Symmetry: D2
């Protein structure tokens, strides 16, 4: 609840072009696999990324969602997957990777269900804040240490509906 | 699951154009409210529709989701993350049909006393209606066809199609 | 996290005797009903009350649980019922009624599913704190305006395992 | 559901006496820990066992529950309310059997890095074992009988029985 403004960091056209490329890369890697494929989105902030990405993934797959959230608290599952992922190619879809804490644990949890393969695709990556070494196979943008909003990403539950990635700039 | 094929019914160009008009309507309806706004999507089928629609709504709003049980009781597998009391709420569904689940969800959310409560569905099947629930914003009125795509699935398939396709049985 | 002590308000034997009586009353009211019966416990604090009460209810019924919780926030469902309650005699089982806010909303939610009948059984009632008129058909004890612990009821996640109802007394 | 009847296998007197001994064992094991303790019950079948057991544990602990999906994937319908990192955790189940669900639940909880992780089951069926999961505290070892009562159900019936009964088919 602080006075601020929003400046564009990644224009709408830039995102669409990038996701189009991500789609080609993901398609190329999973096109020859004989197993089923699942895209797992991490609610709440990844609904928009998922919607645009899966339309660019030219491979027959399923779409599922799970909801997790963390002083230093445990990563708990508020909403689990609807479908089973055992023996399937699973691609986790996240909006942004900050410290890597949450996504590290989520990958550990899903790995217990023994999928055929397990990979991560995040739209934004903020490497300056990384605290845990987590392998990310697909990254849309590596971004500076700014607090970003838009495209499903929020600031105090605000600005999710923005078609672009903006950065919050404080005043005073 | 049966031997089948899928052909285009509503191209993504026509879906995009229709959602643009929906966004203008919603914006017109809620611009001068003053109260906080929130779009509530019913997972899973409404995630893609939500992503495109909320980008066409030129009004400051929040985005939330809930997952309902899908006769049997409508139970909540995942509730909303935020409150809706005193807010303008627009329920976002992929397809209204029998009216059952959407009628129960509206009743549940009404108990939390929001300022207003409306429903926006991408597809509507007027014929299959069993409960007369009011829908304010409808994308397409379709006959009783087996449709997939744009979040709508058939045995967990075709959710990721950018278009609304019709399933042809063989 | 304040220095305190715990004094007995309702001894273990007093509770057991009271629940035994509650069991007789509940049995008498639902023994002649031709429909199925469900006892719905509100997690987390009502697990112990439920366990002792249902053993005193001499009527063939089911046991289910749901988890709800509320400035002035909405009552949300964190865990819903496993089974359907439509056309069934439903008895809500709660540990304690303070303001009545939560239980008022929960009763409204369950009523939407159109059960044959809907009633509330709480172990403790604190009438001095009531803010909403909610009908409670069965009450174990009406208690003074004390902060109670034990028998599933906690203070900072502590003292749930106490076989008696105690009251927290602050020091200094 | 079939035509049947239920007779007593383990009277509530013997259940109570056994849980008293379990409480002494658990108390002995965890008295000098110093770290926070928490009993985790697997709903629904373990609520009655939890209520009687935790009252017999003379060590300051917390009480939590989780609900797991019950081959198919073990999914979490309801997670724990509190954290278990650095704490002594005792999973409380009504009956260990094939070992499947309890093995997965233990793996999931282990990721949260608790100080210790043990399992306490009221009933054990050694014969039906498919996954060798270590159980530290066992109430009764029983043969492969169809048992109900004390939280254990048969088509959502007999959960409220104070005793362990055997189902006799007709
Ligand atoms: O710049 C930011 N803007 C908004 N949120 C930010 C930002 N950086 C981290 N976060 C929080 C992201 N968190 C959680 C954000 O995802 C959930 C979004 P919401 O459900 O709307 O609160 C994950 C970071 P990590 O994987 O390192 O644990
Ligand atoms: O033609 C169809 N194709 C695919 N699905 C169809 C069709 N008609 C109804 N449905 C499903 C209708 N359902 C869809 C519910 O949407 C939930 C999305 P999901 O979580 O993937 O099952 C609701 C019927 P009502 O709201 O009237 O109670
Ligand atoms: O004396 C008390 N000791 C502990 N808790 C107390 C007490 N009074 C109210 N509460 C809180 C009870 N609340 C919630 C307690 O139930 C849930 C227990 P937990 O899940 O362990 O936090 C309900 C009161 P109302 O129906 O008026 O909304
Ligand atoms: O003889 C039996 N009577 C009734 N139930 C029985 C019996 N054997 C196993 N079960 C069920 C075993 N289940 C019980 C799981 O408990 C969950 C309680 P609920 O939520 O009521 O289904 C687990 C088997 P495992 O842990 O080895 O994977
Ligand atoms: Mg995220
Ligand atoms: Mg739908
Ligand atoms: Mg309560
Ligand atoms: Mg069990």
């Amino acid at each position: 609840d602080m006075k601020h403004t929003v400046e564009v960091m990644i224009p709408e056209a830039e995102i669409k072009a990038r996701i189009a490329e991500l789609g080609r890369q993901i398609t190329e890697r999973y096109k020859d696999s004989g197993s089923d494929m699942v895209l797992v989105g991490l609610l709440r902030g990844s609904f928009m990324f998922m919607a645009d990405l899966c339309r660019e993934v030219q491979v027959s797959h399923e779409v599922d969602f799970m909801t997790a959230s963390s002083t230093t608290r445990d990563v708990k599952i508020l909403k689990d997957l609807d479908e089973d992922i055992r023996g399937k190619d699973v691609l986790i879809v996240e909006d942004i990777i900050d410290s890597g804490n949450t996504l590290s644990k989520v990958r550990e949890i899903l790995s217990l269900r023994e999928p055929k393969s397990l990979a991560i695709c995040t739209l934004l990556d903020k490497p300056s804040r990384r605290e845990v070494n987590v392998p990310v196979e697909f990254i849309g943008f590596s971004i500076p240490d700014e607090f970003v909003v838009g495209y499903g990403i929020d600031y105090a539950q605000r600005y999710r509906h923005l078609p672009y990635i903006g950065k919050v700039i404080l005043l005073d």
